[PDB]
Symmetry: C3
Amino acid sequence: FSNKRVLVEKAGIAVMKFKNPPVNSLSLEFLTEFVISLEKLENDKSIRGVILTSERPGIFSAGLDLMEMYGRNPAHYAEYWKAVQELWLRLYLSNLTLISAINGASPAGGCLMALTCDYRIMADNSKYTIGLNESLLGIVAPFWLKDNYVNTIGHRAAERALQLGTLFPPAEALKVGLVDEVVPEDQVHSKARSVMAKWFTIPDHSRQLTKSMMRKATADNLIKQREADIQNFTSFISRDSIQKSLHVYLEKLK
Amino acid sequence: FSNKRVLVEKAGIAVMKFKNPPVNSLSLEFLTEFVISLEKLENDKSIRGVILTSERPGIFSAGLDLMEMYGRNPAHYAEYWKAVQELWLRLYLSNLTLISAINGASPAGGCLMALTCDYRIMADNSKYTIGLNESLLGIVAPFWLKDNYVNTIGHRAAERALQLGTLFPPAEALKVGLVDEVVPEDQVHSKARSVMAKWFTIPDHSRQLTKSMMRKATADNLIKQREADIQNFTSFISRDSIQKSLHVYLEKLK
Amino acid sequence: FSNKRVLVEKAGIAVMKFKNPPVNSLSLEFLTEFVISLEKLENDKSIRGVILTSERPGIFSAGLDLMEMYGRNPAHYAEYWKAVQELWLRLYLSNLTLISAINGASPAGGCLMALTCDYRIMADNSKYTIGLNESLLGIVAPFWLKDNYVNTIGHRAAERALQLGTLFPPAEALKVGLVDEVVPEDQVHSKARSVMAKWFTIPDHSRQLTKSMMRKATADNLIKQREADIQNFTSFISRDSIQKSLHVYLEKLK
Ligand SMILES: [Zn+2]
Ligand SMILES: [Zn+2]
Ligand SMILES: [Zn+2]
Ligand SMILES: [Zn+2]
Ligand SMILES: [Zn+2]
Ligand SMILES: [Zn+2]
Ligand SMILES: [Zn+2]
Ligand SMILES: [Zn+2]
Ligand SMILES: [Zn+2]
C-alpha cells in the first residue's frame, strides 16, 4: 500500500483514510492510488469489510479536482474520466462490505463514494453537508452517478436535489435517506465498526451475490457504453463556454 | 398569444392561467393553444420559468373533456390523443422551470400537468384533491403518465392510488409526495414566485441538462412507440363497451 | 377444490387458507394445489377478490421447504423451481384483487406471496416478522422477487434488507412500507374484508388493466428468460458447497 494519498489500516475490517489535504480533492493520483489499494484489500481474503473516511476531520472529500480538467488536452480528459468511472465501478461493484464514516463535508465527488457504499454514517455536525451540487458549478452529474442517487433517495427527490444542486446537512440528509444514520462526531468511527460487525454476521457468498444482483443493471448501463461516456465528457468539458465557467468558478475560489 | 383558453402574463417569470370554465376541461382547443403558447415562451430568451395555474380559483383542471372522445370517428381520436401526448411531452421535456400553483381541484388530466412540473405547490383547501382517478371513470392512465406518477410517489403508492383512483386532499398529497408544499390559499402564487426565484439561482444550461437527463428515458419510452400508443387509445376508446360506460358516466354528470 | 393444503372458502370474496402445518412450508404439493385452486377462483365470475391467510394463527408461511431441494436430481430442481415461478407469476399477474391477512410470521417464501398482493394487512403481534432473509440461509432471493421487493419498499431499503436478510416486526414493516396496515390480531380478517369491499367499488375492467399495466414489465422480465432462470437455480442449488450449507442449516433445525 502506497499509503500516500490514502492510508490503509488494519478483525476483517480495514480502514481507508483520505490523506490529500486541504480538501481531499479527487486528483488523478488519488483516484489511481485508491483503486490500486482497494484491489489489494479485495484480494486479501482476511479483509471482509472496509470503512471509508477522511484522516482529517472537517472535509470527507470535495470531489473532483477542477484543475485536473482545465486547459488540458483531450487525451488527458479521456484518461481522467476513465479513472473517475473506474473509481465508481470498483466501489459500486465491490464484494467487500463498504461503510462510509462521513466525518466532514461531502459535496459532489465525495458524495459519489458515499453513494457507492452499503451503509452511510454521518457526523452530527451542522457544518457538514452532503449532496451532488454539480449544477451550481455549471456541471452535471454523470448518468450513472445519477442512477445511483435515484436508487438512494428516490427519483422525485433526486430530480429536485440534482437540479438545485442541494447540499443536505445531517438531519436533512437523514430525512431524505441520503445517509442511514447520524451520530455525534466522536462516535462516527465506532458506529461504523458496530454496524460493520453486524454485516459480518451475514454469510459472505450470499451477501455478495445479493449485492451483485441489486447493482449489475446500474453498473452494466455504464459498462456497455463506457467509451461513449468518455467521449461525451471530453466533448462537453472541452467546450469553450464550459471551459470558461470552469475558470470563473476557479477564480472565485481565491 | 391567443390568450383565449390560456392567459400568458408578464422578471423571467411568465404565468399561464387556465381560462376554460366551468372546469378548465382539457378540450382540443385548449390543448392546442397551450402547446403553441408554451412554445413562444420557450423561444423567448427573456423567459426562464413558468407558473401554471387556474385564472379562476376552485378547479385547477378537470382533465380531458370526455365529450371530445364520445361518438367520434377514429381519425378524431387519433388526432385528439396525439394532442394529449403532445401536451405531456412538451411540458415534461420543457427547458423552462415549471411550477404548478395548484389553486383548485386537480383530478386526472389536471394532475398530469402538475406531474410534469419541476415543483408543485398546493392551496391548503380541504376541498381540493389531486390524483389520477381514471379507473373510477372506467378508464386507465396511459403508460407514460403512469411512469411519471411512479417517478413521483413511488411504485407501491402509485399501484394503490391508480387502481383505487385515489384523490388526495392537501395534507395527504403532501404526505405521499404528490405535492412538494402546502400553503394557505392566498399564499400559493407568492410562494410559487419565491420558489421560482430560487430555481433561477441555478445556471440555466446545467439545470436544463440535468433535467433532460432525469427524464429522457421516460419520455423516450413514449416517443419510440407514439403511433402505437395512438392506435391503442383509438382501439380501446372505440370499444362499444367502453363507449357505453363513457355515456353512463356523462349522464351521471347532470 | 382439493381443500387439502389450502382451504378455499365462500359476496365475491373467497378466502384461501394455508393448511400445511407445522409451518405452512411451500412444498411442491402445496405450490401445485395453490395454483390449481387459484385458477378455479379466477375463472369463477362470481369471485372478484381473494384474501390469503393461514388457517392456523402463528405462522403465515415459512416459505420454501428446504427438503424439496436437498439431495435431489436436476430434473426435480427444474420442476420444483418452475412451480415456484408459477406461484409467483399467477399471483403477481392475477386479475383478482388479492389481500394478505398476515396472521403469523412470514419469512422468505411467505413474504413473496404477501409481496404479490394488492394490499397487505398484518397482525400487531410482536412475534410476527416479515421479510426476505434468504441471505442468512446462504441463499439469495431470485431477481424477479427482488424486483417485486424493490417496487414495494424502494431500492435503497431493499438493498439493505436483502443483504442483511432483515425480518421486520409489525411496526417496522409498516414504517418501511412492507405492509400497508397493522391492526390487532383479532381484527386482521375483518379489516381484510373492509378493505376488500372498498376495492370492489372499483370497476373491475379498469382496475385490472391498471394493475396489469403496473406489473407487466416486472413479470415479463422473468417470462422472457424463464428457462434460463430455471437452469441457474438448478446449477446454483446443485453446487456441493451450497448443497452443504443446505445441510448444516437443516441440521441446526433440530
Ligand atoms: Zn493526463
Ligand atoms: Zn477515529
Ligand atoms: Zn481512534
Ligand atoms: Zn377532430
Ligand atoms: Zn394571484
Ligand atoms: Zn394577484
Ligand atoms: Zn420431482
Ligand atoms: Zn377469522
Ligand atoms: Zn371467524
